[PDB]
Scaffold this active site. Structure first.
Site, short mmCIF file in Angstrom:
data_model
loop_
_atom_site.label_atom_id
_atom_site.label_comp_id
_atom_site.label_asym_id
_atom_site.label_seq_id
_atom_site.Cartn_x
_atom_site.Cartn_y
_atom_site.Cartn_z
N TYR A 126 -3.79 -57.66 48.66
CA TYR A 126 -3.84 -59.16 49.07
C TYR A 126 -4.89 -59.64 48.92
CZ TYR A 126 -1.94 -62.91 52.24
OH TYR A 126 -1.32 -64.17 52.67
N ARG A 141 -1.02 -63.27 55.54
CA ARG A 141 0.34 -62.65 55.63
C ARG A 141 0.02 -61.01 55.72
NH1 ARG A 141 5.20 -63.73 56.67
NH2 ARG A 141 5.10 -66.14 57.00
N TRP A 193 1.92 -74.82 52.79
CA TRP A 193 0.56 -74.19 52.48
C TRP A 193 0.19 -74.12 50.91
CZ3 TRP A 193 -1.84 -72.67 56.77
CH2 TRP A 193 -1.08 -72.17 57.80
C1 LIG Z 1 -5.89 -72.12 49.81
O1 LIG Z 1 -4.89 -71.15 50.49
C2 LIG Z 1 -3.58 -71.13 51.05
O2 LIG Z 1 -3.57 -72.47 51.67
N1 LIG Z 1 -2.61 -70.40 50.98
C3 LIG Z 1 -2.18 -69.71 51.97
N2 LIG Z 1 -1.37 -68.75 51.89
C4 LIG Z 1 -0.98 -68.52 53.39
C5 LIG Z 1 -0.07 -67.46 53.69
C6 LIG Z 1 -0.09 -67.10 55.28
C7 LIG Z 1 -0.90 -67.89 56.24
C8 LIG Z 1 -0.70 -67.38 57.51
O3 LIG Z 1 -1.74 -67.91 58.08
C9 LIG Z 1 0.48 -66.79 57.90
C10 LIG Z 1 1.83 -67.11 57.57
C11 LIG Z 1 2.47 -66.30 58.62
C12 LIG Z 1 1.92 -65.75 59.54
S1 LIG Z 1 0.18 -66.04 59.52
C13 LIG Z 1 -1.79 -68.71 55.39
C14 LIG Z 1 -1.84 -69.03 54.03
N3 LIG Z 1 -2.32 -69.91 53.47
N1 LIG Z 2 7.44 -63.42 53.54
C1 LIG Z 2 6.45 -62.94 52.57
C2 LIG Z 2 5.47 -64.08 51.86
C3 LIG Z 2 4.89 -63.22 50.73
C4 LIG Z 2 4.17 -64.46 49.91
O1 LIG Z 2 4.90 -65.77 49.39
N2 LIG Z 2 2.88 -64.17 49.78
C5 LIG Z 2 2.15 -65.20 49.05
C6 LIG Z 2 0.64 -65.53 49.52
S1 LIG Z 2 0.64 -65.32 51.28
C7 LIG Z 2 2.16 -65.08 47.39
O2 LIG Z 2 2.20 -63.76 46.87
N3 LIG Z 2 2.19 -66.24 46.69
C8 LIG Z 2 1.51 -66.03 45.45
C9 LIG Z 2 2.52 -66.05 44.32
O3 LIG Z 2 3.61 -66.27 44.70
O4 LIG Z 2 2.24 -66.08 43.11
C10 LIG Z 2 5.51 -62.05 53.33
O5 LIG Z 2 5.20 -62.11 54.44
O6 LIG Z 2 5.09 -61.05 52.62
#
Ligand SMILES: COC(=O)Nc1nc2ccc(C(=O)c3cccs3)cc2[nH]1
Ligand SMILES: N[C@@H](CCC(=O)N[C@@H](CS)C(=O)NCC(=O)O)C(=O)O
Ligand SMILES: [Mg+2]
Lengths: 198, 198
Positions: B7, B13, B103
């Site tokens: 991660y 997440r 986000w």
């Molecule tokens: C600059 O970084 C972001 O804004 N990206 C970002 N990606 C994210 C993914 C998840 C979360 C988060 O706190 C949760 C989502 C669902 C449960 S905790 C917060 C996030 N913030």
């Molecule tokens: N519902 C998924 C969300 C996964 C997700 O969208 N992760 C993001 C960061 S929290 C990510 O890999 N984004 C980077 C990208 O899409 O290139 C989980 O909980 O694993």
């Protein structure tokens, strides 16, 4: 026990549960509410959402929580704990995408650009990822149908409403769709269910 | 088995998975990538998203799928089949709300407005529902801690960053966050984890 499902008259988030009950040949009350009764019904709900499944007047909520509950110890579950994880993961991957759509959007232009954005740029990438993931196997996970296959057929049915050409390049995802649709209990349900847009 | 969690350097997440390993006292490699390295890793993931968790060389994805897998057959899952459902439902309820926030939005004036609407118009309804749901009980589900309790503490920590007064009218909710944070293995993880905004 006595099962009552409460949702709108649409497939939407109740349809995965309707497929599971169809497949398991389990009778239930498919209660479909009148939109005018919505404000009332909503103030009886644990979190103000449907669907809810009442099980002998014990209330369950959250459509995928309920789906997982119903398929526990059935052939729909995944054949091992790790395969169950892959079934959960595929389902959430599809749900995450579907939940990106502003289904309850007001400005019918702002809606339609968000939709166009998601369908033009995001959906093809997902379709390609799903087609690679499936490769040449029969079902998404393991050697037999799981509720993830049901969820693919449900999700893509709605996506094809907004983008008919979605699978023109993905005959193997079409094949999987038609295999789910051909399972006799699912076929009977598809033929019997109310015709709704979503 | 050999576990490798991948991660960003963020709670985000992956945090729910980190809590479960802390609570179960299970060693894993906590692999935190910087942005420079993300595009190359992405292209090897069948769905291009993290967290992922490699288990004896097999890759799992989807944070709540992975969390549900790791808690199966432990005290964290819920006791009866119905209690497992309620754990999944509360987790999904929290997650659906966390999902509304843009986000990724890069136009921060539109980002900030959205966050603020959600936190003012929507969040308090959900707090009220969760508080009513909890009632006078020690934990969300059953009579012992489950991973729904951990996900409450995690989600609320992130919410409190943006809306510090979120729980001012919800002392029973604050008591629950403090109970989770007092569980010694969780306490030790919170003390030692990298400090990141999210
Ligand atoms: C600059 O970084 C972001 O804004 N990206 C970002 N990606 C994210 C993914 C998840 C979360 C988060 O706190 C949760 C989502 C669902 C449960 S905790 C917060 C996030 N913030
Ligand atoms: N519902 C998924 C969300 C996964 C997700 O969208 N992760 C993001 C960061 S929290 C990510 O890999 N984004 C980077 C990208 O899409 O290139 C989980 O909980 O694993
Ligand atoms: Mg979800």
């Amino acid at each position: 026990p006595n099962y009552k499902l409460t949702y709108f008259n649409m497939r939407g988030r109740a349809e995965i549960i309707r497929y599971i009950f169809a497949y398991l040949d389990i009778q239930y009350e498919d209660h479909r509410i009148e939109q005018a009764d919505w404000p009332e019904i909503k103030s009886t709900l644990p979190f103000g959402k449907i669907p809810i499944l009442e099980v002998d007047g014990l209330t369950l909520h959250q459509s995928l929580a309920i789906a997982r509950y119903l398929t526990k110890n059935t052939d729909l579950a995944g054949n091992t704990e790790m395969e169950q994880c892959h079934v959960d993961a595929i389902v959430d991957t599809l749900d995450d995408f579907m939940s990106c759509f502003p289904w309850a959007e007001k400005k019918q232009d702002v809606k339609e650009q968000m939709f166009n954005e998601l369908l033009t740029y995001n959906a093809p990438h997902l379709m390609q990822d799903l087609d690679t993931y499936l490769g040449g196997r029969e079902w998404l996970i393991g050697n037999s149908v799981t509720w993830a296959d049901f969820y693919w057929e449900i999700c893509s049915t709605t996506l094809l409403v907004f983008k008919p050409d979605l699978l023109d390049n993905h005959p193997r995802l079409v094949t999987l769709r038609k295999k789910v649709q051909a399972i006799p209990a699912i076929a009977n349900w598809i033929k019997r269910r109310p015709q709704t847009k979503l």
